[PDB]
Write a protein that binds this ligand. Sequence first.
Ligand SMILES: Oc1cc(O)cc(O)c1
Ligand SMILES: [Zn+2]
Ligand SMILES: [Zn+2]
Lengths: 396, 395, 145, 145, 358, 359, 181
Amino acid sequence: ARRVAIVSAAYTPKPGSSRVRQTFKEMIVESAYKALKDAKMHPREIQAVAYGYHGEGISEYGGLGPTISDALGISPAPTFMSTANCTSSSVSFQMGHQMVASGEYDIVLCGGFEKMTDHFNYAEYIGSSTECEYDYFLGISHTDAFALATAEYFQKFGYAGREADVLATFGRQMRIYAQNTPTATRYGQPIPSLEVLKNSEACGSMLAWGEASGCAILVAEHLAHKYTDKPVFVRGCAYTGVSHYFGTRFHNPTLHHPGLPKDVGMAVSANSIACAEIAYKKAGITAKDIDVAQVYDLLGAGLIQMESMGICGKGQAGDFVLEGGIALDGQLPLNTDGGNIGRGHASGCDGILHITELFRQLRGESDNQVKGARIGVSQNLGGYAAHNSVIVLSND
Amino acid sequence: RRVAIVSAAYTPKPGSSRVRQTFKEMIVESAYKALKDAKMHPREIQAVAYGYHGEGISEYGGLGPTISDALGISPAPTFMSTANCTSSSVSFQMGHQMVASGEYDIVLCGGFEKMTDHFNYAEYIGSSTECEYDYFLGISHTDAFALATAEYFQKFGYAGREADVLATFGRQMRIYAQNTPTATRYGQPIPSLEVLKNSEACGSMLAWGEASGCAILVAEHLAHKYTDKPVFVRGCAYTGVSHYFGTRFHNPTLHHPGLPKDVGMAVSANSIACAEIAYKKAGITAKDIDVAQVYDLLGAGLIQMESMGICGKGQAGDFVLEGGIALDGQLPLNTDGGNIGRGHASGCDGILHITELFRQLRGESDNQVKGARIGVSQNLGGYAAHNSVIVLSND
Amino acid sequence: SMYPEQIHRMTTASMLREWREHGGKYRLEGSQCEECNEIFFPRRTVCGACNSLSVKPYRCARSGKIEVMAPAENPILAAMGYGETVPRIMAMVRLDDGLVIASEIVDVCDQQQLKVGAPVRMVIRKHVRESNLAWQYAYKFVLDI
Amino acid sequence: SMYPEQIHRMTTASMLREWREHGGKYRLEGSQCEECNEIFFPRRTVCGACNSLSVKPYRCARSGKIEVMAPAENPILAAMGYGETVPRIMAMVRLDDGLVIASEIVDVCDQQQLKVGAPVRMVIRKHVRESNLAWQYAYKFVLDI
Amino acid sequence: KIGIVSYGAGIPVCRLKVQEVINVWKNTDLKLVEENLGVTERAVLQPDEDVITLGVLAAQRALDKVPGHQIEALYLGTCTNPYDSRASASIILEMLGSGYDAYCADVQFAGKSGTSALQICQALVASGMTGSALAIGADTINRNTAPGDLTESYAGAGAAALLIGSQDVIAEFDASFSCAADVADNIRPQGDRYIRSGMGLGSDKNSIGLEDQTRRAAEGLMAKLHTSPADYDYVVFQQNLVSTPYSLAKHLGFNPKQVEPGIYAGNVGDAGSASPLLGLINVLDQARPGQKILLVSYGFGAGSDAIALTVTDAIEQYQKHNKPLRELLESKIYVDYGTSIKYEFKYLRADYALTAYL
Amino acid sequence: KKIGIVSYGAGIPVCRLKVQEVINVWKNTDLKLVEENLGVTERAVLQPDEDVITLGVLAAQRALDKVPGHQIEALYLGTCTNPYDSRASASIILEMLGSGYDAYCADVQFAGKSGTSALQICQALVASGMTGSALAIGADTINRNTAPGDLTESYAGAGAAALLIGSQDVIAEFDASFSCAADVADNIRPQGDRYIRSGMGLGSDKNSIGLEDQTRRAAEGLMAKLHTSPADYDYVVFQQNLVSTPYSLAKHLGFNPKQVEPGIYAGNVGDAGSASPLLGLINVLDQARPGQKILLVSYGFGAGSDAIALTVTDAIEQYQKHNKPLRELLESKIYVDYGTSIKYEFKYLRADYALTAYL
Amino acid sequence: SCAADVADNIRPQGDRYIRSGMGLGSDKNSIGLEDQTRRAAEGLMAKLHTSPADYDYVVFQQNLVSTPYSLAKHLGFNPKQVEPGIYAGNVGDAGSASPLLGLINVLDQARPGQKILLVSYGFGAGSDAIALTVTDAIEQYQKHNKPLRELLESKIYVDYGTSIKYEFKYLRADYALTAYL
Ligand SMILES: Oc1cc(O)cc(O)c1
Ligand SMILES: [Zn+2]
Ligand SMILES: [Zn+2]
């Protein structure tokens, strides 16, 4: 039960931009060897790796563990794989933390990647990670769930007449964060006006698809002094899983948790509340301790996560976003690197993208820096809350 | 801290197909049978480490939460492992770290393979290599083992005894499986040696089937509530090497001291390295081993016994010919019948090894090694692309 | 076509998958527990609430109302076999027995009639063709008006 | 066919995969490290021995000897696109530079000449057709006498 | 006393105005098709509809009148069958979930497949081999009609299911008479998607096939029953067009009052095997007890089925709570010719589709 | 009065192709497996000028020749390899027989059980008194609709059988029947496809979900209706795509091999499709004595099954006194190589539009 | 070079098989094979002011072994000028390679200074005529070279069933579930 610290974290820049020239093996080496350089450590010093991608159906490449190890040239160091939608990296990070905390491995590398251009149309493939017999094979995409989830939230929480404004305000705030973050895909672009964003596609809340690989180096606490001046520790993390089927959100007898709201729906993610409550208790903090956070953003799905994370009351996330509360001077800065709207989004690499910005935030290195930040939390979901990962990081 | 296995079970006759039940039903069967053996309620599980070949078989991806909901343990997390034949071997090592880290006290570890959901599962198998330079070129895993067998017998002067060695190894699996109730080849008559030499693959061909298996890992101090005789984990090692079959002969990427200069397919450099790391971690040498489990297919069993340190380079054939892997032999091998007799589901194979060793260390195996205090599982994925060595002792 | 050269395909679906799911997709069959009478859909082997192995097939209510709906008009997200009909009306249907089914609404005679909470009934329709050339049939929902 | 209904297919290969691998598959290009002068195949970004990112492409020797061979005669293990030629002769080819390639032998004019250590040369042949309808060509080996 | 216990129908909602087809192809006169033939619009099959989809709907609607019915026999009558080997009636039986132990087969004889299957079910119940039986006549003529064909403007689809039993009969089965011959007026060889004509469309083609077999079957049944056209309150013919029953009536000695109740295809078109059965439904929907009905259907490659019915007094209690066929035909969606060709998969698209729009 | 089979006739192609000829070309299966376990040493080849209607009318005419001056009241053709997808092929055979125009006519299709399904329909017509007699035909050209290189190509054949149901001079009484069905797409052919396709890999797993289940359900269902056990019946007749299949089903259902052997015929014919259960009944009827009880159970994929029980009447002795046995008809055979067989059955990929015969 | 619109053999777009515009025979040869070949050869010789007797070797289209000899007899070339170029006795119609493969077999035995006349025929219809002179460098070239004839000795025999199978001439399923299903 020893402490684990993050000595380094890096990912390929512009994750919302495709990297059609390099193979996924080239892409993975790039992010890892840049992170190893930051930690002043040799690649041979890694004793094992926990990596993650969507599944063998994209690049038609299965059992990827040994190929990753050989690609990095750390053979015979093992590589542990995780295939869990957008939380593939978040689960790979949690796996690596358990590998170092167990004392079986002293230095581990945890990352995720998504090389979507290897598939002709990657958007059709995505649905293969659900209750495929009753949704994928029926023509139900993952984007459908987020579209319906956004609809139920606005409709049952009295946001009629303000739906376009809330989505555009969140999307605009993501552009503002991403304009000055050099690793963001929307970096350097002008900020569209609020009225322009409401007329754009998905009212400005559509994410930027792309490709990226990222990784973070975890080391035992006593070994951390050799590799980093300012280490970031892991207070606590939780991972939870419920049925992939979208219908079970409203009716979930399998899920067992206390205090869950009676009116569970797509707008009120029951699994997301459970995962947050487990992680907070395990990390020894309440929601009032978070100085900066990172959530999965797509249409109104960001609003649902803020309420499940305890940032604001049920039905209040929209008004919170409208009041500039997730701005840098707002009550809680949210997705300070630009999020999936501005930074970009690769499903396999999403978890590391969250840790990296939180990692930079707790070391004062973020481009939009929360003054005196001590606690950083990453909220991530796979599928539609079928997976859910909440990770808590502190700087001291 | 120490972890102990309180129960381990798998669906019977893994070499025979279960076309009537879905893979969810199949996973639940082994899981809830294992819970009954350990006198523990299903809601007591805090996390799961399961494994399957890949999302391409049943077209089911992101399987973690589906497993948790299938078992009815939500919101308990399920950590997925997709690493060829060692999917269960890798997943067991994942659960060991979850319990040893202290983040979870009770963890269920297993694997499954539902091959009948794919029209032709065999042609899909190659999807887990260096796909661009073997899968897309028509080179399957089965091609690798056939070549490796050919190099072994040819490099070590076994010419003229190849059919005898494979049939002697194959027939020993048939004899072991006949009295093992859960084996697929259970209760069948023993074919003659000469009949096996003229049969397909000289009698060393394994039995393709489907099965789900699982084993319960618990922290040492909690183990006494669930079982009277727990089995501990001395040490485990996992190693990764290039999927490409040509790299066995020439692999400067693999950095491990003391490797023989004649590395090839007949001498697995990765399997030697993995065995040495596990033996050091468990604090035991090869002479300590009382019973073992290998991935048996063609002559791949012979190569694995040598890489495991049981016999010198080239002795396995003569070792098997001298009846060494028999119950009265110096070291019994695959006492449940192995892949030839018990059967094999690729994702489920790691638990199939652990269950027999788990049963052997508790004196419960049908072909029982008297006084076995240690058991070792050798498992490989691809052609030694993965290699997993887990050491279990009862003291 | 004219050159019968086999084309590479990783995954070919066996008839067994849909064969086991004929009850679920054709007749909207879920599962009900014998101890606590809790109902689920899709079918499951283990009860969720009381965690009993004793679970039996259950015919879900074929009538229901729309809990939430969202049109699918984006051509980038058009899936093979479903690109002919634009736009597809995705909706979560709260059946009469309380269960919620994720499906789509078809045969919208009156655009004004379709709204949140409108009554619908289950129908059987054609879906994407199987990888083994067999026609796939499964449920959809139409407005019950 | 005469009914142009889309048929389900989970994976459709992008042309990018084979495009980046033309050097490896058409020209048998591996990788050579500049600092320590070690060569590998297939191509790689990181050198294995010295761990330097300074790596360059390398044209492997297209001649070699048969290190080990095994016929593939089993129809159960026949793969799509490769079922027309029976039996396919699988072989590990030790190139003249010391590297080992896994491929097959074709155009066996004299059966007696096919034995271990026989000299072979690389040739370009047609392989399984791509998921994107593009023909696929890659290397094979024939006896070099 | 064995006859029809209940019935149900299935119609596609999408409609294509006849003028749309003429403006593209310009292959026939609009006045002739609208006024002489009597079809102003036809039903368009959606991408997710076929014989089984419409068929199981009509079957489910018939069985909903008899709750908890156990299926003892199910015969699917169709010439546009989705499977050339294996029976689709097995799939419909599975979808109904009313039991597996049942007589099941696919009956096919062009437009008389629906009635021919009705004769099967009648024989099973009358012979005591089953206690009840389900007959389904369905066809997707629009799917199997080539673009540019003269009959494209009025090719439609539909399904009709009638449950035969001895308990609570609403229309008795008095007797039947059937005939056949080798008259290749319309043929679809094996493997062909589209039904083709054996000769030019016209009165000459109707006299040798449609009118010949219909007259022989109708006469054959009437002579067996010693009845004349004046004894029947309604007559129901094959109804590929609205003109066909009226034209057949004048040829057979029936008055227009006897045909009009069966006319339904003004906005549907050629429904294939279902047209004689859908016409019977439109008649049974407003019939009074005691009235006599004569149904004669025509299937090409020719033969004909003649069936005589008597409406029982139980028809009153049946119609009290039921939706008539005329009301079902009110629900319609309109599409242009471009959409109709896309829905019915009549664009020449690539054999192997990489993505849906590529 | 008792209603049952009055006469029967069969039509089988004369061309034969040794199984070894197919294996040598494709090398896709073990020769010992097909010849010894499966029991097919050679299969029937379809000439260019014969098909379902050719064999059907030949089988139909041969049965009507036993009853001179007969008038056809109903004719049903049961086949899954139908030459016409629209219009009834049975109407053509009716015209060819020239025994009457006024007859109940249709095409019945349900895979291998189309023959018995048509037999059941003819029985219902006569027993219900809707007709005085009825003619049922089970025919198929499986070899024509089996692709080259298919695993089942080596034992794919063709054949036709016809049975006359009547109430006068019955040689085999129709006691009772039982049928079941389900959606089990073990083998399927969609509309427009020429070749029958499999739903999964061949094996005992594929057999257990379709062939074994539907045959068992139908058999046990019928025997429970009559309250009889396997020991009551003198002969049993199953689907006979392979010689192994009737034996395997008997072992599964509890019939000793002696009840199966009289029905075996397809050692040199291969899979005869819808005619295989009827052809097996014909070889039984050629040698049966009066009083013997016959149990016939058929199988059609996309699965359903038909079970029918018969009793042999005293008229059988007069019938076979001047009759050509099917076994005698199976001796007439012409052998072709694989090249000719592919040419005869139109399996060469030839030009869509042919200017001349060889151009 | 010369050309015209003579549809003696055509393959329309989307057709796999080459089709004949008329029945095979000497009449079909005169309007296409014989006309265009004569026109191109006579046109070239008139440009070079040479006669058939000046060339040591002549190379024609070699769909068949008979075609160059018959064309030579027609155009006035004695057999010895043709025989060196013949190779297709065991190959068949090699298509576009037949004039080039004939030249290779000639160059394998040619001496410096010898004159070669190559006239090829492509249906549809057209003919290309090319005249060559052998340089002194051929002697050095042939010192280390595998001749065409030696390469043509390597062959593997198959029956008709396999040949049809190898070339995908069986009418198989459009969509193949497995290799043999
Ligand atoms: O698995 C995924 C789900 C989703 O909604 C988006 C995406 O890019 C991947
Ligand atoms: Zn319960
Ligand atoms: Zn180097």
